[PDB]
């Protein structure tokens, strides 16, 4: 998990659904 | 994008069963290996360490990951989120370092026909936590207000206090890939190749080479998925969501057969050595 910013609602959702790694 | 960023129902149906099966097989296999070891030389100590760290890796990886499919909400605490990735990375580190130590030991067994093994195992178990420490201070739950739900993502925060943590998070995927795939795989392959050259019998050579190939093949997809997410994710292409969706698919598959590599070590001992064959036999 790593996102450029906390304003785009796509990366954060992806890390919500991703695995813990 | 359109917003089809979701996990397929068929994917959940297959993956729950597959993950449960590999989890149970791993726990029974590694527990039996540890019990047999308990009931004494450097190879035995290293195999015991590999089995113990393997059990830790499965019990810290499979349960929460398979919980992430049914609920995908993370109702746990902030400290648990801050801690679990650290333990997972430590387990991976000790696993790969134990594989490295085992390869070196098997080379020296045929090339140069326990205190040193203990001082080389304490070094492994401290180096792993030393290198996994940065993971423990990065993860943090943040509740982002999605357009329709109140998320609780436990992620690596893009904005954090320490500057070194930002510098590391810049290339976390690269460093992880390097240290946990390239170094152990390359060192194991080099040591086993020199070992086989010194010996030449062929059964042991094919055994060690097949073990190395199995390790590489079963550990590649996680690093591949992380690298793809790092380098192939863009900002102004409508396909991004689909790619991300596909990433999730690949990512989960990795973790599954990542644990498969975990359980390949006990089976490899059952299929090769007569002593362990008899040990597991009854």
Descriptive account of the structure:
The complex is a heterodimer of chains A (21) and B (282). With 21 residues, chain A is mostly helical. Helix content of chain A is 33%, strand content 0%. Chain B has one domain: Rhopdopsin 7-helix transmembrane proteins. In chain B, helix 1 (9-38) runs antiparallel to helix 2 (42-70), helix 3 runs antiparallel to helix 4 and helix 6 (172-199) runs antiparallel to helix 7. In chain B, strand 2 (145-146) and strand 3 (149-150) form a beta hairpin. By secondary structure, chain B is mainly alpha-helical. Helices cover 78% and strands 4% of the residues of chain B. Chain A: Disulfide bonds join 1-15, 3-11. Chain A: This is Endothelin-1. Chain A: It comes from Homo sapiens (Human). Chain B: One of its GO terms (cellular component) is plasma membrane. Chain B: Residues 71-82, 143-170, 234-245 are extracellular.
The total strand number of chain A stands at: 0
- Rg calc of chain A: 8 Å
The CATH homologous superfamily of chain B is termed: Rhodopsin 7-helix transmembrane proteins
C-alpha end-to-end distance of chain A = 7 Å
- Distance between the amino and carboxyl termini of chain B: 58 Å
Task: Note the overall shape of chain B.
Answer: globular
Q: Looking at the structure, what is the overall shape of chain A?
A: flat
Total helical elements of chain B: 9
Class of secondary structure makeup of chain A: mainly alpha
Quaternary status: heterodimer
Main sheet: strands, sense, barrel of chain B = 2 strands, antiparallel
- N to C succession of SSEs of chain B: HHHHEEEEHHHHH
Q: Can you tell me the CATH topology of chain B?
A: Rhopdopsin 7-helix transmembrane proteins
Question: Roughly how much helix do the residues of chain A carry, as a percent range?
Answer: 25-40%
